[PDB]
Design a protein around this ligand. Structure first.
Ligand SMILES: CCCCCCCCCCCCCCCCCC(=O)OC[C@H](CO[C@@H]1O[C@H](CO[C@H]2O[C@H](CO)[C@H](O)[C@H](O)[C@H]2O)[C@H](O)[C@H](O)[C@H]1O)OC(=O)CCCCCCCCCCCCCCCCC
Ligand SMILES: CCCCCCCCCCCCCCCCCC(=O)OC[C@H](CO[C@@H]1O[C@H](CO[C@H]2O[C@H](CO)[C@H](O)[C@H](O)[C@H]2O)[C@H](O)[C@H](O)[C@H]1O)OC(=O)CCCCCCCCCCCCCCCCC
Ligand code: CLA
Ligand code: CLA
Ligand code: CLA
Ligand code: CLA
Ligand code: CLA
Ligand SMILES: CCCCCCCCCCCCCCCCCC(=O)OC[C@H](CO[C@@H]1O[C@H](CO)[C@H](O)[C@H](O)[C@H]1O)OC(=O)CCCCCCCCCCCCCCCCC
Ligand SMILES: CC1=C(/C=C/C(C)=C/C=C/C(C)=C/C=C/C=C(C)/C=C/C=C(C)/C=C/C2=C(C)CCCC2(C)C)C(C)(C)CCC1
Ligand SMILES: CC1=C(/C=C/C(C)=C/C=C/C(C)=C/C=C/C=C(C)/C=C/C=C(C)/C=C/C2=C(C)CCCC2(C)C)C(C)(C)CCC1
Ligand SMILES: CC1=C(/C=C/C(C)=C/C=C/C(C)=C/C=C/C=C(C)/C=C/C=C(C)/C=C/C2=C(C)CCCC2(C)C)C(C)(C)CCC1
Ligand SMILES: [Cl-]
Ligand SMILES: [Cl-]
Ligand SMILES: [Fe+2]
Lengths: 137, 451, 50, 82, 341, 334
């Protein structure tokens, strides 16, 4: 197997429009997801709240939905609870809260799209391992 | 061949620095050239860290051990631990690295060109290991220098800008100390604390005032000892009690450094005052308490009454009593309830954690600290995979407290061995049998048989 | 004195006494087989070979 | 004593020695390098290249399951790959 | 003065590396087991037999490279290169696991070669062959662990693979499936090995610290002549020291060096025996009385029961990937787990 | 000679069947206390709540253990690193339930054994010996400090000390593998090299000196009767053993200085065992073994398992089952 454009094609918005990433971006998002998110989100689980993974099917039943790049860039700007009813930038790094979450300062809109690409591509590659936790290691 | 070979000195090459025992000048060169390498390393390493430093990552995520020591001293850092000015780290680096060249220059001078032995060229620097008066004089001088050096840390804290105070109000800030603690009941009460749990001997010092005051006492004490030894010679009981040789003096100091390395290992592992967790990452206990706080908060937010949730064992899932009754976090963390840190103490009442404060007064900044500290616990692999042993690759992290405590245990253990080695050798050299048993007068053969 | 682990070496140059040892050993083994078979007959249940 | 061969201390300091091995040693190194860089070792030993452990849309390993049809098994997998 | 005797002369010449008649067995098999291991770890996969990468070529490092065992479907096949399975096809031989047999069998004959070398050299020089006898324990271990154990099991799959992390896998497998730490033959083996390291260290240190003064310098090594009648340290002072420190002390130097041979050699032999038991799953797995009481008394817990809970977790969590030919599928819900973890 | 001096001379007397010494003045009482407490506890102590969750573990024979399964059980995790002398408890019944005997034994034992080391130095000084046997003993002493003191300190509880039992020792080894991946740690690999090679060299030296014993007996008596205690001459021909062993490998792989040969035997295992003791001491602070889990991935990014991933599956089996009632939150951080 290898890394192909069919694999690097991910939803851009919820209307169906996709975008097709490149090797260089996917690696950038893995590198930036490490720097920024892996401390709590390593492997697609969430250590400080295991009930909530980055599985593509979880990001689908999110409100607003999150299984596309725009939905994710928006989470990373202004994050919410799963039902959308609260903003949690106070306890979840985002551009909004980049003063209290320094690692978010030096990120640019292209960085955030790298990171979401990664998140949406990675389960195409690993499947159940991504968001499964230690059962699947 | 002034020693410098095995046949004249009696020492092989693999024990060659022992050819220096009675070459005071060449020996001075080796100490100063070695002093050279230390100051060099302080310099090179600080620069490396600075060149590799990203102000927007926590220090503890970047493998920094020396910059956190400069930050602890109040240079380059502001409220919360935030880095504001990197220049002082640069300065500290360069000044050491530049200084190392003069040490090296004069150490190499003395080891080669200079007089191999100082005793003809000058009666002040020359010495003889056996001159108990001259040896205490050097001791006393060096004591004085150290009492001065401890007073430099007081100067920094009281006059020249203060110290990073993790306990400071509003989440931590650099602070001038002006009422150091001099009450010796406090200062030496630390020396009499048990080293066991909940007391911690001097690793327990938890406030800069006690720290500064103890450096006023140590500095003055060290200055009186300097003078005392310069003006005194050793008493009869001390004469009869020790061995007076170069190697014995070495073995005594190796003993002392060993002891010190062991204490430093526990200082860096347990103490979050002079090793602030903002710069060094949380302590082991602190991360483990922080996990319990994290899921107290999460579950309480969903509507759990955390004070009455009975866990599987019958003990409280979030809160239980310690053996003396204090309210503490439940689960394995129960062993860590002695933990104390600025992010948790606000919820502490007189009986321990206060349920009302837990129900009502947890601020987002504490939720954040506790999530941060829990996800940066000092666990990781030797190739810097962060996590428990069973974690997959992703997080490149080992806590600076793991690095500093592991390295200094190893060193302390090996210097205790050095102590036993040179101690027993010094004893047997002075008594005259370090090269073996004399066939002509083997002591055992003059002893009565055991049975 | 012979060490305990060498005592049977007194038969090396004694062919008659080595036969004697070898016969006693044979007697022990046949004795065992006869003994084992009797213990097994006295406890074997033949009522169900299935 | 001495069994008769030339002393090693004398050979690796001789010039003749280094004249010979300042070629042979590097040459053998390049050959090993070339063995891998040509991708020729993958082919001799049957070791997958990064792109040929799995087919694009399968996550099951090609384990052999029969003793005598086993060489026939392995070849089947290598073709369910192009 | 025949050709046989001429060939004997030359094989037994004093050279840098003695050859002997045993060299004809020893050097070929030892060199080939070796080179086969080197070749497999550098270049050869375990992808088709185990579902694993195992070479430098695949990106393994020295800890995780291995010549892995053949697939379970091969049973106990010799896996001869010219055999039914690989049919002379070298490449398919490597992918099927041939290098494992190649190294197991060649090295087994290499070891024979080495013991016969010990006898050959012992004999030409004039010494009692006690070194050869001591090497029986390494051979005993090689045979029981690499040959006997898997002949008792379904196939060579379950032998040890030749690698550093592969052996560690073997260790844990034995814990989880055989409860090998509880086996009295391993306990004796542990006692023989730890006891031999102890005797090593204490004899070494004792002699170094009862030496006589035989030169006038501080490096005491240069004061020994290989051709001196004198004992170089004092048995008498050594004996006094240990009698007073520990209560007893050796007093006979022959006994002492026999003891050093006897202890580790006997430990390894004892552990061989236990492994031959485990070839059959004839394990010291349980204590029946404990299980009978534990089954009936929920409040009864010992370290023995705790450890079987740990064994049970090893078996269920490692089997699917460790025995891929079984196609074990364990849903999350049947996985044994304590609270929270 | 007055009272103190007659005593001082008795204490340091080299004529006592067992040397006493100043180190022995401490070692004797502390070892006695530990040995008496250990024996009574092993036979008769009631169950101990090792993990602090009110779930006692039976360790003594009278409560249904045998030699293999019995132990002095470590003190309760609720106690963490607090000192728990008898006088700190409300009743011996409380001290037993919470595992007080483990503290008493290990403290007296570690103190007693440190002075054993010291007493080895001391007697060597009175005997006119070289002093460094005690340096060799320091390898096993540190090893014991590592499992009984250091590892508890790093993890914050004596409940995670090594148990004083045969099966408890295995429990401790298993949990350690799960939490630190010790097999994958180089210092423990050094300790295996320490003890395999110490056993290897111990057979080699025994086998080789035994091989080159000089005929001095007949075929019927034990060869041991050809050494006489105190004899000046050596009983074996080291030239001959070098001659055997130089040829077995080659001439320079083999020692011909008896002094060099014995220092090597001392040094090899002592060093190796220093390193494994240090490995336990440093994994006390969670600097763990190499982690190569998912280190190999293919062009697409599937995980390509190595043998390290297989270890990790077993590790995970250990992780999730151990102390099955003691974790309420998902990371086991100490
Ligand atoms: C000649 C020498 C003669 C010596 C003989 C007599 C020695 C008696 C004392 C024995 C010491 C061993 C027990 C140490 C156990 C322990 O809990 O030690 C740890 C204590 C630190 O205690 C901890 O101290 C902590 C202080 O932190 C507290 O305060 C901090 C303030 O910031 C934080 O707020 C933190 O949250 C808060 O909890 C708490 O008190 C903890 O509860 C408490 O465990 O360290 C210490 O006292 C610092 C020094 C400990 C010594 C290091 C061990 C030495 C090992 C030698 C190895 C031998 C080598 C082999 C030999 C061959
Ligand atoms: C110390 C000494 C020092 C010197 C050591 C030097 C090493 C010398 C080199 C040794 C070479 C070893 C060859 C091993 C071959 C082996 O056995 O290979 C195994 C085969 C048997 O084949 C196996 O047979 C099994 C049983 O099947 C049988 O049963 C099935 C029913 O279910 C079917 O009917 C099937 O057709 C039928 O074959 C399965 O088929 C297995 O998958 C298949 O591998 O036998 C055989 O070659 C022959 C079996 C006869 C025994 C030969 C003795 C050697 C074995 C000694 C160990 C036995 C004790 C083990 C402990 C128990
Ligand atoms: C580097 C530091 C250092 C060193 C190496 C020495 C070394 C020495 N000193 Mg000096 N000293 C120092 C610093 C130092 N001193 C300082 C800073 C002061 C000022 C307080 C003094 C004051 C001082 C006095 C007043 C005397 C010495 C003496 C001596 C000699 C005997 C040492 C002795 O018996 O040890 C200690 C060994 C002992 C057997 C004493 C008992 C030690 C117990 C068991 C330890 C606990 C007591 C401890 C001191 C206090 C409590 C600590 C506790 C809370 C943990 C020796 C040359 C003596 C001498 O010969 O006079 C010149 C003497 O009478 N020194
Ligand atoms: C921290 C490390 C350290 C230090 C500082 C020393 C220092 C010393 N050693 Mg030891 N030694 C060491 C490690 C060290 N040693 C180790 C690791 C070994 C094991 C091999 C030895 C083995 C050993 C033996 C066998 C002997 C010494 C001897 C000596 C002394 C004289 C050396 C001499 O004549 O060399 C002369 C060497 C040269 C002229 C070569 C070059 C020397 C210089 C220093 C090179 C470096 C230049 C450096 C970049 C500085 C320039 C920078 C500029 C800005 C100033 C000297 C005081 C000797 C002694 O005691 O004599 C009585 C002796 O015989 N040492
Ligand atoms: C502890 C370190 C130490 C000691 C004890 C000595 C001792 C000695 N040296 Mg050496 N030397 C040293 C370090 C040391 N040196 C260093 C680092 C260098 C390189 C800079 C040299 C370079 C050197 C040479 C080239 C020569 C000597 C010579 C001498 C002898 C003459 C004394 C003299 O010049 O008095 C003079 C003392 C003074 C004028 C007092 C002022 C000295 C400074 C400014 C004091 C500053 C103290 C400072 C504030 C403390 C903090 C330092 C640091 C932490 C920042 C004497 C044996 C001479 C010799 O052997 O003759 C052949 C000689 O020619 N030394
Ligand atoms: C046909 C088999 C056979 C025979 C006839 C011999 C004969 C002999 N052996 Mg050899 N030996 C054998 C098998 C045999 N051995 C095996 C298999 C081993 C390996 C385990 C050895 C290892 C061995 C050693 C190391 C030595 C001998 C020695 C000797 C001689 C003295 C034996 C003696 O006094 O023991 C006396 C024995 C006792 C007083 C009691 C021993 C108690 C044993 C261990 C348990 C009891 C066994 C029990 C009844 C079960 C029987 C087993 C059966 C079912 C197989 C004698 C010539 C000795 C020698 O060389 O003398 C010069 C010697 O040093 N043997
Ligand atoms: C002493 C050296 C030695 C030994 C013991 C072995 C042993 C082995 N090798 Mg290695 N091998 C060797 C050298 C050796 N090899 C060398 C030098 C090479 C490089 C060319 C190889 C390359 C090699 C490969 C590639 C393979 C082996 C394999 C094998 C195995 C099967 C051997 C077999 O079936 O042969 C059968 C052949 C014989 C036994 C020869 C007997 C021939 C005659 C006809 C016997 C009858 C004589 C006659 C009746 C009377 C004459 C008497 C005279 C006095 C007149 C076995 C483990 C296989 C293996 O490891 O697979 C798992 C395998 O695939 N070997
Ligand atoms: C003249 C004398 C001739 C003597 C011949 C002696 C032959 C026998 C010697 C066998 C030595 C075995 C060492 C093999 C180690 C090796 O090459 O690893 C080679 C590997 C190569 O490195 C691996 O390469 C891979 C390539 O895909 C990946 O990049 C891995 O990440 C990388 O680890 O190196 C390491 O493992 C790092 C150092 C290993 C050192 C281990 C200490 C030795 C014990
Ligand atoms: C004696 C001896 C020895 C030793 C030696 C020694 C130890 C020495 C050291 C030395 C030294 C101790 C030296 C030093 C040097 C230094 C240097 C030379 C420096 C310089 C600096 C500079 C040049 C800088 C620059 C810079 C800056 C300013 C900034 C940024 C950039 C940089 C960093 C570049 C030996 C053993 C070998 C041998 C025998 C004898
Ligand atoms: C700074 C500080 C502080 C303080 C400090 C102090 C004050 C200190 C002290 C300390 C001390 C003050 C110490 C002590 C020391 C001592 C010792 C360490 C000693 C030792 C001794 C010896 C070693 C001995 C020996 C011997 C004997 C016993 C017998 C006879 C012989 C001899 C002599 C050998 C505090 C904590 C508050 C805080 C922080 C900071
Ligand atoms: C198998 C086979 C074969 C053969 C083969 C061979 C014979 C091979 C050989 C091989 C070899 C012959 C190889 C070798 C290799 C080598 C290497 C791979 C090495 C490496 C090493 C190293 C890496 C080292 C280094 C080091 C270290 C690591 C540490 C310390 C230091 C030193 C420097 C020592 C044949 C053809 C028959 C066919 C069948 C199959
Ligand atoms: Cl457990
Ligand atoms: Cl927990
Ligand atoms: Fe010996």
């Amino acid at each position: 197997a290898e890394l192909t454009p069919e694999v690097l094609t991910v939803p851009l918005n919820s209307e169906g429009k996709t975008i097709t990433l490149t090797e260089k971006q996917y690696l950038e998002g893995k590198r930036l997801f490490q720097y920024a998110c892996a401390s709590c989100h390593v492997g697609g689980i969430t250590k400080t709240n295991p009930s909530l993974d980055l599985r593509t099917e979880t990001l689908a039943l999110a409100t607003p939905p999150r299984d596309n790049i725009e939905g994710l860039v928006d989470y990373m700007k202004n994050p919410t609870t799963y039902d959308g009813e609260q903003e949690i930038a106070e306890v979840h790094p985002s551009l909004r809260s980049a003063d209290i979450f320094p690692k978010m300062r030096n990120l640019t809109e292209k960085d955030l799209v790298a990171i979401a690409g990664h998140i949406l591509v990675e389960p195409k590659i690993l499947g159940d391992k991504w968001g499964g936790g230690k059962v699947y290691y | 061949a002034t020693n410098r070979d095995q046949e004249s000195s009696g020492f092989a090459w693999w024990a060659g620095n022992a050819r220096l025992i009675n070459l005071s000048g060449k020996l001075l060169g080796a100490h100063v050239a070695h002093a050279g390498l230390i100051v060099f390393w302080a310099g090179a390493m600080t620069l490396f860290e600075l060149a590799h430093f990203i102000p927007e990552k926590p220090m503890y995520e970047q493998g920094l051990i020396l910059i956190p020591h400069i930050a602890t001293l109040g240079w380059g850092v502001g409220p919360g631990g935030e880095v504001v000015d990197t220049f002082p780290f640069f300065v500290v680096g360069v000044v050491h690295l530049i200084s190392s060249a003069v040490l090296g220059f004069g150490g190499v001078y003395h080891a080669i060109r200079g007089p191999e032995t100082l005793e003809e060229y000058s009666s002040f620097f020359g010495y003889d290991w056996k001159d108990k008066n001259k040896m205490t004089t050097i001791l006393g001088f060096h004591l004085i220098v150290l009492g001065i050096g401890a007073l430099l840390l007081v100067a920094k804290a009281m006059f020249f800008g203060g110290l990073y105070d993790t306990w400071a109000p509003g989440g931590g800030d650099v602070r001038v100390i002006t009422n150091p603690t001099l009450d010796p009941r406090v200062i030496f009460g630390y020396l009499l604390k048990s080293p066991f749990g909940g007391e911690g001997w001097i690793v327990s010092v938890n406030n800069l005032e006690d720290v500064v005051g103890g450096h006023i006492w140590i500095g003055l004490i060290c200055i009186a000892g300097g003078i005392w030894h310069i003006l005194t010679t050793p008493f009869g009981w001390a004469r009869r009690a020790f061995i007076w040789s170069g190697e014995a003096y070495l073995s005594y100091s190796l003993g002392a450094l060993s002891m010190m390395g062991f204490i430093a290992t526990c200082f860096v592992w347990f103490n979050n005052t002079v090793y602030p967790s903002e710069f060094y990452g949380p302590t082991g206990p602190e991360a483990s308490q922080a996990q319990a706080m994290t899921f107290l908060i999460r579950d309480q937010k969903l509507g759990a009454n955390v004070g009455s949730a009975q866990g599987p064992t019958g003990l409280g899932k979030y809160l239980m009593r310690s053996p003396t009754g204090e309210i503490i976090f439940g689960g394995e963390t129960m062993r860590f309830w002695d933990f104390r840190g600025p992010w948790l103490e606000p919820l502490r009442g007189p009986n321990g954690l206060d349920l009302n404060k837990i129900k009502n007064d947890i601020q987002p900044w504490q939720e954040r600290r506790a999530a941060e500290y829990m996800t940066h616990a000092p666990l990781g692999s030797l190739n810097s995979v962060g996590g428990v042993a069973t974690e997959i690759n992703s997080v490149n992290f080992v806590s600076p407290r793991s690095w500093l405590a592991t390295s200094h245990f190893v060193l302390a253990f090996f210097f205790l061995v050095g102590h036993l080695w040179h101690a027993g050798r010094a004893r047997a050299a002075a008594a005259g049998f370090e090269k073996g048993i004399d066939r002509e007068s083997e002591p055992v053969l003059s002893m009565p048989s055991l049975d | 004195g012979l060490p305990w682990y060498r005592v049977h070496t007194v038969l090396i140059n004694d062919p008659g006494r080595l036969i004697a040892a070898h016969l006693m050993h044979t007697a022990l083994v046949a004795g065992w087989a006869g003994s084992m078979a009797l213990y097994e007959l006295a406890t074997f249940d033949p009522s169900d070979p299935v | 004593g001495t069994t008769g061969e030339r002393p090693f201390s004398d050979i690796i300091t001789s010039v003749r020695y280094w004249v010979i091995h300042s070629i042979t040693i590097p040459a053998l190194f390049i050959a090993g390098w070339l063995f891998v860089s040509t991708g020729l070792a993958y082919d001799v030993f049957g070791t997958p290249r990064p792109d040929s452990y799995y087919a694009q849309e399968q996550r099951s390993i090609p384990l052999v399951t029969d003793r005598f049809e086993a060489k026939q098994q392995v070849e089947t997998f290598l073709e369910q790959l192009k | 003065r025949g050709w046989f005797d001429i060939l004997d002369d030359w094989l037994k010449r004093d050279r840098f590396v003695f050859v002997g008649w045993s060299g004809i067995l020893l050097f070929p098999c030892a060199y080939l087991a070796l080179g086969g291991w080197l070749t497999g770890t550098t270049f050869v996969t375990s992808w088709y037999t185990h579902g694993l990468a195992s070479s430098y070529l695949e990106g393994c490092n020295f800890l995780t490279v291995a010549v892995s065992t053949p697939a379970n479907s091969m049973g106990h096949s010799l896996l001869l290169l010219w055999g039914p399975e690989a049919q002379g096809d070298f490449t398919r031989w490597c992918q099927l696991g041939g290098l494992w047999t190649f190294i197991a069998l060649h090295g087994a004959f290499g070891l024979i070669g080495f013991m016969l070398r010990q006898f050959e050299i012992a004999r030409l020089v004039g010494v009692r062959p006690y070194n050869a006898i001591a090497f029986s324990a390494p051979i005993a271990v090689f045979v029981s662990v690499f040959l006997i154990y898997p002949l008792g099991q379904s196939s060579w799959f379950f032998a040890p693979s030749f690698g550093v992390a592969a052996i560690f896998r073997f260790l844990l497998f034995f814990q989880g499936f055989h409860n090998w730490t509880l086996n009295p033959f391993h306990m004796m083996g542990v006692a023989g090995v730890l006891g031999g390291a102890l005797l090593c260290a204490i004899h070494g240190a004792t002699v170094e610290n009862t030496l006589f003064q035989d030169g006038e310098g501080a490096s005491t090594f240069r004061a020994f002549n290989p051709t001196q009648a004198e004992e170089t340290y004092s048995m008498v002072t050594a004996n006094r020291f240990w009698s007073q420190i520990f209560g007893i002390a050796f007093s006979n130097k022959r006994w002492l060096h026999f003891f050093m041979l006897f202890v580790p050699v006997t430990g390894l032999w004892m552990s061989a025996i236990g492994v031959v038991g485990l070839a059959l799953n004839l394990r010291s797995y349980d204590f029946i009385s404990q299980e009978i009481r534990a089954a009936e008394d929920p409040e009864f817990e010992t370290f023995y029961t705790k450890n079987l809970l740990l064994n049970e977790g090893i078996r269920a969590w490692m089997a699917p990937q460790d025995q891929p030919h079984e196609n074990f599928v364990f849903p999350e819900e049947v996985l044994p787990r304590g609270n929270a973890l | 000679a007055n009272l103190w001096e007659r005593f001082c001379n008795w204490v340091t007397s080299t004529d006592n069947r067992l040397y006493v010494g100043w180190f022995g003045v401490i070692m004797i009482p502390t070892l006695l206390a530990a040995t008496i407490c250990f024996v009574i506890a092993f036979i008769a102590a009631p169950p101990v709540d090792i993990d602090g969750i009110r779930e006692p573990v039976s360790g003594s024979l009278l409560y249904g253990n045998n030699i293999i399964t019995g132990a002095v059980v470590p003190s309760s995790n609720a106690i963490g690193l607090h000192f728990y002398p008898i006088w700190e408890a409300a009743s011996l019944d409380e001290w037993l339930y919470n595992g007080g005997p483990y503290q008493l034994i290990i403290f007296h034992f570690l103190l007693g054994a440190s002075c054993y080391m010291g007493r080895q130095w001391e007697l060597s000084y009175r005997l006119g010996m070289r002093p460094w046997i005690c340096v060799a003993y320091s390898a096993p002493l540190a090893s014991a400090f590592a499992v009984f003191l250091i590892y508890p300190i790093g993890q914050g509880s004596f409940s995670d000390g090594m148990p004083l039992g045969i099966s408890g020792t295995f429990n401790f080894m298993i949990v350690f593998q799960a939490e630190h991946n010790i097999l994958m740690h180089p210092f423990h690999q050094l300790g295996v090299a320490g003890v395999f090679g110490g056993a290897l060299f111990c057979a080699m030296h025994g086998s080789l000196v035994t091989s080159s014993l000089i005929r001095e007996t007949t075929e019927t008596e034990s060869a041991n009767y050809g050494y006489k205690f105190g004899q000046e001459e050596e009983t074996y021909n080291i030239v001959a053993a070098h001659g055997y062993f130089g040829r077995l490998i080659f001439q320079y792989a083999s020692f011909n200085n008896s002094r060099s040969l014995h220092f090597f035997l001392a040094a090899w295992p002592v060093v190796g065992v220093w390193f494994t003791a240090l490995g336990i001491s440093t994994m006390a602070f969670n600097l763990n073994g190499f982690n190569f889990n998912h280190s190999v991935i293919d062009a697409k990014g599937n995980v390509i398992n190595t043998w390290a991933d297989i270890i990790n599956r077993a590790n995970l089996g250990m992780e999730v089952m151990h102390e099955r009632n003691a974790h309420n939150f998902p990371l086991d951080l100490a």
